[PDB]
Specification:
Elements (H helix, E strand, L loop, with lengths): L1 E4 L8 E2 L2 E4 L5 E5 L8 E2 L7 H9 L14 E4 L5 E6 L9 E6 L1
Parallel strand pairs: 1-4, 3-8
Antiparallel strand pairs: 1-2, 4-6, 5-7, 7-8
Bound molecules: copper (II) ion.
The site of copper (II) ion has 6 residues, from loops.
PDB class: electron transfer
Keywords: electron transfer, photosystem, PAI-PAI stacking
Assembly: monomeric
Length: about 100
């Protein structure tokens, strides 16, 4: 699945902000525009340790930002469920999305 992160106008949005994928399908996030952004998954409370580890592996390090030098990030989540992801710099500006894994 492909998700665009930001736009040419500098809005703090994921495009689209709700994606549904099959187990193990890569989600490629690609930066659009010049504002750097990243993608970090929220870990659901009470998630099993295998899901917590998958989500951490599918998250950017919060000291990492996409830039036109590092324009994409690829995440794979195998466990069925819905998961929220957010951008660290623009979290308070509600730059967040949902990933449903079938
Ligand atoms: Cu951002």
């Amino acid at each position: 699945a492909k998700v665009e992160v930001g736009d040419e106008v500098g809005n703090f949005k994921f495009y689209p902000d709700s994606i549904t994928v099959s187990a193990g399908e890569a989600v490629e996030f690609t930066l659009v525009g010049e504002t750097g952004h990243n993608i970090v998954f929220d870990i659901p409370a009470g998630a099993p340790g295998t899901v917590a580890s998958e989500l951490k592996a599918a998250s950017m390090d919060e000291n990492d930002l996409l830039s036109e030098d590092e324009p994409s990030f690829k995440a794979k989540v195998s466990t069925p469920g819905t998961y929220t992801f957010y951008c660290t710099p623009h979290k308070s500006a509600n730059m967040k999305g949902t990933l449903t894994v079938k």
